[PDB]
């Protein structure tokens, strides 16, 4: 043929498919065992999601959200991520006393259900109504952006204490159990405005610690309503909602590590 | 174009002397006019020599750029600033990726470039060397008048002047002559002064003593000739146009080199635009279509490959430096070991090219001397008071003398002023009886005649040192026969006794056999010339014969020739044991070539000519069946008329082959007729007329100290100290440079594996990219370059001089059992270790192996800022990146470690790593180089930048480690199961 | 620890890279030496 005798090309192949065969069966075997190092409830390491990222429901095309105010079909694309969010804290997904509790309608301290074990059942997490969030269709002009912190496992967010100065200066300072958030631009073109739990402009800390996927399905992160009623129109508006925290940084690569990055821009 | 120049030329040698001044318009004593001269000089042109037209090292260097690997490399730099563009115009990308790997490509052409045009060099000044022999000016009768005139300015047709010390200024028909001697070994390799006269004395013009050449000189006496050829047209400006003009063509290593280019530019592009459809066929936009391509041509092509080629090759050819072996050209330093068929040179080559005293006649008895430059030999004797009588005629009747200054340099080796053979005879006694200068004191010279061409013997009056006697003797020396019809006596072990017919009959059989051996035999006797007949004040007349030259005592007899260097025999064995052909090919005699081709073993005893047959059996040459004859001497003359067709079948009938009394253009011939049966040639030589046929070998092979600068320039390496063994040493070097190259070439194709599937499994399971492009350049261009080097200082498996030569055709570099071990069955391994790493890095920050299907959607998109892992947590862009990354650096450092055991596994072809050792330095030093290198590449803070290298964590490090051993293991197993059973299997399929 | 656990979500990667950086300046002074044992 090209190379061989059929006697050959048959001899080649019985090699390469046993060869290849142990050597899948190897490859298995070491996946085997990598497994067999780690838990279920807890990954390995964690130091790389470490300090919180800070996300939100519009899905920018660039850390961006320009829109025409004067247009239906200008905003149905953020209305539709917008909606995929709200959409998971209904009602009738919060049913029963399995697996939800009912927790302080004001911001109240952690809360801790044992271990990482499965020595009980699926750990019960607190309800949050998305009511909580006044105001927010959506914001066919001025939009209504929601905020959230990223889930992390036995991560406990520590508020900062009002030992010194701070940006909102004192200002509805619940030290004790709210992890504030603090949008800004100088460039003081807007009118920032706040819906969360309790009133607050944070997160509650009676949602914390989460305790995994595995030990806490159906689990709800608390949000933060962000509105920009802002006066101004028709120019690109670079607002920056910062989170403030003990176990808060932030990095200059990393432009969402507690932070946002949003080009709100209502064209119209 | 040169096949004219390939034939024997025609002269006018039989014209009178009168007649071939009408040919050119010349007249015999006053010689051309001024304005004749002119005239011709416009008419034919300037009596110069034009270099052929070169090369520009412009186009030189780019005709590297463009060679498979260099083709697919500037796709790839091209299609980078493709990429790059199409970014620029649709979404604003502030990045530099595209644009600086495009950057970066492009100078891994340009260096690579520069590597191959390193190897790829051509040193050739032949015409250069040549012009150097046409002397600046020539003497000249024009209007009767002789003048000095630039020598370009000669014509055909003028009266030239010559005498000794000046360079034959064009090709001359002798006129007139007076004791003219000229240095024809221009056209033969002969130094041996040769007489020129007008009369005509043989048909063949490079034999006849009216003709004198360009590119000779003249060496005593005067001359007068007529100008017949100027320039080009001069026998050796032929010659010198031929040897500058043969095209060189590509040596076995670089047809090696393509050969290899063209399987993994093949593969290269097979995989590229396979997976190039396979990609748009998954929806792939054009976008991303090209960036996948970009990365499958890094992963194919092995960037540093070329390169280590280079550098092996050139650290081979230092360790021959230090031999006292110098390479022009690179490649030369494998051709060596490909060598099937060597043609050499006699004279300078082969011999010591000095006249030596080789064997000694008396007491009835034949002695040998030792012929080797340092003396390696032992005595033959020195008790005899026989000896010491012929020892004191070889000094006394012997005008030659040492060159001041010599007593630094061993007697062999000095400068002597005289005739070669009383210049043998001079250091033949200097040597074993010491200083002659005092023999020649303590017996002062009272008269002599110097040898006569009537006489043919020369004699010798001196005053004996003996005290008790203060006579004179007598001392004569001449041809054997003439020596003897002038002897009454003989010197036997001391005393006299009368030469009766049985020792008459001795010295015949004596004389013969010294014959037979090609040597160059005199006569010596002496005569104590009678006291009382002679007073202490006897005048002796010199012009008439005063004294007796009859009844004398004959001494003894003494042979010399032009004998072999000392290492030449052994080497010549040694070549012919590692299964090469050995041919002489020579300018001179066939007495004396067939008589060097057994001494040396070119010819092998019992082995017979047609003619050797034809005289044993006393029976005509014609009855000889000539397939009884394994060994044939083919003279010049007969060569001259045998067609290509029948030179062919010459060479395919006879196992031992010389080639005698040969022109230049006739070595080519040969040369050219053995390589037309698909071998390999060698030539090596020392003459100008070793020009064309060094020029045309596969490898040309000068003598240093002996070569003429012109043989020099011809040839691809250089012999500095004219030893002979280095050709022995230099094929072996060449037989364990190329299994070195195939063991350096596996180990560098192995990684191209674990390269390639990453980009595959990126595109066919849609995860996130296990390996970037930029890491496959720090490995091709990084780890893996002192690791694929130093297998160049792997020691032989086995006795490689005692396997025969390779078969070009048959025998290659790369070959299937190569790809099929690199690509098939090592890289395999490779691969998996370095996607079992990437899997444990994702799968402890919390991505496992089973959620990793089908993400890299999500993964790769910048605006997700919270993809879920397996545990339920969020990661914005650049952390995951930050993850990913450290999994690119992790696989790097997974293909480092697979490297470690594969260098080990690539250390022997054959043997295991427990037979052949650790013992090279240079390998060991590349372990602990590249894994520096890794760790410096990864834990140097600022890396993650330049790079996107991440600190890897210690467990990180030991995660291909179990594949690395099972390499090691397979590969220890695999070659057991080889040497086990030499049948085939394991061995057809996968033996290098 | 408890709500005090914030070494869970950390690692030294400083010291990590010094005692790197001093392997691969150990392996390379290593490499020379042995290949310095005749040039
Ligand atoms: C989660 O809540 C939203 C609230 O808008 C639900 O949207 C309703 O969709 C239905 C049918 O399309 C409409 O008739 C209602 O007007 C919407 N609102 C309400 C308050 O009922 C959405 O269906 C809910 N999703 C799930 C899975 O229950
Ligand atoms: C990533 C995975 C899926 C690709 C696997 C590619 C396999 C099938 C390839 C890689 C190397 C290949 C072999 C390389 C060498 C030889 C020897 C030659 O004389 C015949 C073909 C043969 C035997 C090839 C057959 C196919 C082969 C085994
Ligand atoms: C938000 O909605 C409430 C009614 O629910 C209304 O009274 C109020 O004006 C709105 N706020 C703004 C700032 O538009
Ligand atoms: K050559
Ligand atoms: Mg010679
Ligand atoms: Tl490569
Ligand atoms: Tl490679």
Request: charged share 20%; hydrophobic share 40%; with cysteine.
């Given at each position: 043929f090209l190379g061989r005798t059929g006697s050959s090309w048959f001899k080649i192949f019985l090699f390469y498919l046993i060869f290849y065969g142990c050597l899948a069966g190897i490859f298995i075997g070491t996946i085997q065992v990598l497994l067999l190092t780690l838990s279920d409830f807890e990954p390995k390491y964690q130091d790389r999601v470490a300090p919180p990222g800070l996300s939100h429901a519009p899905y920018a095309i660039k850390t961006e959200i320009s829109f025409s105010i004067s247009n239906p079909k200008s905003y149905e694309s953020f209305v539709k991520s917008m909606h995929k969010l709200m959409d998971l804290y209904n009602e009738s997904s919060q049913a029963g006393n399995s697996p939800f509790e009912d927790c302080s309608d004001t911001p109240a301290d952690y809360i801790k259900r044992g271990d990482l074990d499965d020595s009980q059942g699926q750990k019960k997490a607190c309800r949050f109504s998305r009511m909580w969030l006044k105001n927010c269709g959506y914001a066919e002009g001025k939009p209504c952006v929601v905020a959230k912190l990223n889930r992390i496992i036995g991560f406990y967010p520590k508020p900062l204490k009002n030992t010194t100065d701070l940006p909102e200066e004192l200002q509805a300072n619940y030290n004790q159990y709210v992890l504030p958030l603090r949008c800004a631009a100088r460039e003081k073109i807007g009118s920032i405005e706040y819906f969360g739990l309790g009133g607050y402009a944070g997160f509650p800390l009676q949602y914390y610690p989460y305790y995994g996927k595995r030990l806490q399905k159906k689990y709800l992160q608390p949000l933060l309503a962000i509105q920009f009623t802002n006066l101004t129109q028709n120019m690109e508006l670079r607002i920056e909602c910062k989170v403030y925290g003990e176990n808060i940084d932030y990095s200059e690569k990393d432009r969402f590590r507690g932070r946002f990055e949003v080009k709100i821009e209502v064209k119209s | 174009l040169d096949e004219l120049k390939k034939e024997v030329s025609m002269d006018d040698h039989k014209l009178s002397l009168d007649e071939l001044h009408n040919k050119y318009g010349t007249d015999l004593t006053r010689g051309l006019t001024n304005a004749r001269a002119k005239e011709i000089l416009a008419r034919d042109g300037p009596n110069s020599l034009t270099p052929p037209p070169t090369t520009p090292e412009w186009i030189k260097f780019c005709r590297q750029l463009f060679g498979g690997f260099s083709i697919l490399l500037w796709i790839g730099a091209i299609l980078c600033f493709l990429a790059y563009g199409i970014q620029a115009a649709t979404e604003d990308e502030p990045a530099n990726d595209n644009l600086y790997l495009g950057v970066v490509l492009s100078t891994v052409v340009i260096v690579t470039g520069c590597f191959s045009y390193y190897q790829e060099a051509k040193s050739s000044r032949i015409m250069d060397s040549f012009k150097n022999m046409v002397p600046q000016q020539a003497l000249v009768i024009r209007d009767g008048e002789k003048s000095t005139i630039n020598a370009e300015f000669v014509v055909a047709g003028d009266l030239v002047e010559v005498k000794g010390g000046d360079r034959i200024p064009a090709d001359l028909r002798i006129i007139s002559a007076h004791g003219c001697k000229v240095d024809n070994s221009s056209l033969t390799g002969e130094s041996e002064p040769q007489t020129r006269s007008p009369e005509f004395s043989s048909e063949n013009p490079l034999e006849t003593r009216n003709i004198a050449f360009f590119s000779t000189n003249c060496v005593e006496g005067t001359a007068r000739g007529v100008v017949v050829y100027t320039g080009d047209r001069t026998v050796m400006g032929r010659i010198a146009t031929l040897a500058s003009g043969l095209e060189v063509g590509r040596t076995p290593i670089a047809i090696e080199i393509e050969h290899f280019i063209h399987i993994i530019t093949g593969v290269a592009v097979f995989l590229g635009v396979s997976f190039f459809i396979l990609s748009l066929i998954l929806g792939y936009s054009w976008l991303e279509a090209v960036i996948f391509l970009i990365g499958?041509?890094?992963?194919?092509?092995?960037?540093?490959?070329?390169?280590?080629?280079?550098?092996?090759?050139?650290?081979?050819?230092?360790?021959?430096?230090?031999?006292?072996?110098?390479?022009?050209?690179?490649?030369?330093?494998?051709?060596?070991?490909?060598?099937?068929?060597?043609?050499?040179?006699?004279?300078?080559?082969?011999?010591?090219?000095?006249?030596?005293?080789?064997?000694?006649?008396?007491?009835?008895?034949?002695?040998?001397?030792?012929?080797?430059?340092?003396?390696?030999?032992?005595?033959?004797?020195?008790?005899?008071?026989?000896?010491?009588?012929?020892?004191?005629?070889?000094?006394?009747?012997?005008?030659?003398?040492?060159?001041?200054?010599?007593?630094?340099?061993?007697?062999?080796?000095?400068?002597?002023?005289?005739?070669?053979?009383?210049?043998?005879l001079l250091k033949c006694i200097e040597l074993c009886c010491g200083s002659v200068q005092g023999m020649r004191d303590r017996n002062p010279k009272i008269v002599e005649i110097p040898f006569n061409s009537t006489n043919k013997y020369q004699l010798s009056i001196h005053e004996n040192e003996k005290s008790s006697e203060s006579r004179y003797l007598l001392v004569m020396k001449g041809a054997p026969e003439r020596i003897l019809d002038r002897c009454s006596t003989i010197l036997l072990n001391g005393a006299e006794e009368p030469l009766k017919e049985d020792m008459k009959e001795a010295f015949q059989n004596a004389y013969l056999e010294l014959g037979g051996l090609g040597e160059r035999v005199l006569g010596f006797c002496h005569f104590a010339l009678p006291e009382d007949k002679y007073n202490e004040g006897y005048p002796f007349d010199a012009d008439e014969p005063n004294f007796p030259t009859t009844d004398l005592c004959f001494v003894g007899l003494m042979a010399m020739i032009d004998p072999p260097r000392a290492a030449v025999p052994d080497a010549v064995g040694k070549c012919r044991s590692a299964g090469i052909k050995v041919i002489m090919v020579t300018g001179d005699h066939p007495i004396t070539a067939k008589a060097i081709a057994k001494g040396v073993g070119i010819i092998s005893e019992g082995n017979e000519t047609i003619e050797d047959i034809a005289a044993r059996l006393n029976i005509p040459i014609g009855q000889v069946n000539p397939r009884d004859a394994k060994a044939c001497v083919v003279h010049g003359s007969d060569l001259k008329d045998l067609s290509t067709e029948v030179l062919d079948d010459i060479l395919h009938y006879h196992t031992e082959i010389v080639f005698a009394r040969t022109s230049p253009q006739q070595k080519l011939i040969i040369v050219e007729g053995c390589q037309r049966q698909g071998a390999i040639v060698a030539v090596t030589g020392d003459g100008v007329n070793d020009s064309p046929a060094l020029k045309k070998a596969d490898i040309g092979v000068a003598m240093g100290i002996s070569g003429s600068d012109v043989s020099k320039q011809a040839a691809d390496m250089i012999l500095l100290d004219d030893n002979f063994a280095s050709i022995v040493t230099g094929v072996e070097e060449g037989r364990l440079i190329f299994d070195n190259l195939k063991k350096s070439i596996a180990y560098t194709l192995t990684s191209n594996i674990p390269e390639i599937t990453p980009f595959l499994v990126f595109i066919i399971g849609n995860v996130p990219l296990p390996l970037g492009t930029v890491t496959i350049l720090c490995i091709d261009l990084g780890t893996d370059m002192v690791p694929a080097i130093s297998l160049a200082y792997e020691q032989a498996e086995s006795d490689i001089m005692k396997r025969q030569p390779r078969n070009p055709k048959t025998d290659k570099l790369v070959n299937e059992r190569l790809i099929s071990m690199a690509y098939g069955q090592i890289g395999m391994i490779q691969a998996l270790g370095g996607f079992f790493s990437y899997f444990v890095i994702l799968a402890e920050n919390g991505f496992l192996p089973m959620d990793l299907i089908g993400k890299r959607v999500r993964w790769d998109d910048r605006w997700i800022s919270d993809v879920e892992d397996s545990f339920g947590q969020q990661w914005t862009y650049e952390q995951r990146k930050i993850v990913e990354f450290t999994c690119h650096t992790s696989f790097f450092i997974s293909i480092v470690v697979v490297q470690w055991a594969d260098l080990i596994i690539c250390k022997t072809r054959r043997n295991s790593i427990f037979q052949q050792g650790m013992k090279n330095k240079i390998l060991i030093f590349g372990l602990f180089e590249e894994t520096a290198l890794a760790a410096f590449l990864s834990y140097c803070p600022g890396t993650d930048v330049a790079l996107r290298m991440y600190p890897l964590k210690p467990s990180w490090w030991f995660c291909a480690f179990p594949y690395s051993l099972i390499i090691f293991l397979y590969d220890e197993m695999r070659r057991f199961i080889i040497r086990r059973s030499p049948g085939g299997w394991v061995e057809q399929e996968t033996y290098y | 620890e408890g709500p005090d656990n914030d070494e869970r979500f950390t690692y030294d990667y400083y010291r990590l890279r010094v005692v790197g950086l001093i392997v691969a300046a150990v392996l390379c002074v290593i490499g020379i030496i042995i290949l310095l044992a005749g040039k």
């Open positions: - | 499958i041509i890094v992963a194919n092509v092995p960037e540093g490959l070329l390169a280590t080629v280079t550098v092996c090759l050139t650290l081979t050819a230092k360790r021959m430096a230090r031999k006292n072996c110098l390479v022009k050209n690179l490649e030369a330093v494998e051709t060596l070991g490909s060598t099937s068929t060597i043609c050499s040179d006699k004279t300078g080559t082969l011999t010591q090219n000095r006249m030596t005293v080789a064997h000694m006649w008396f007491d009835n008895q034949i002695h040998e001397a030792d012929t080797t430059e340092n003396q390696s030999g032992a005595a033959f004797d020195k008790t005899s008071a026989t000896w010491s009588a012929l020892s004191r005629i070889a000094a006394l009747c012997n005008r030659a003398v040492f060159q001041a200054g010599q007593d630094n340099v061993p007697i062999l080796k000095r400068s002597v002023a005289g005739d070669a053979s009383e210049s043998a | -």
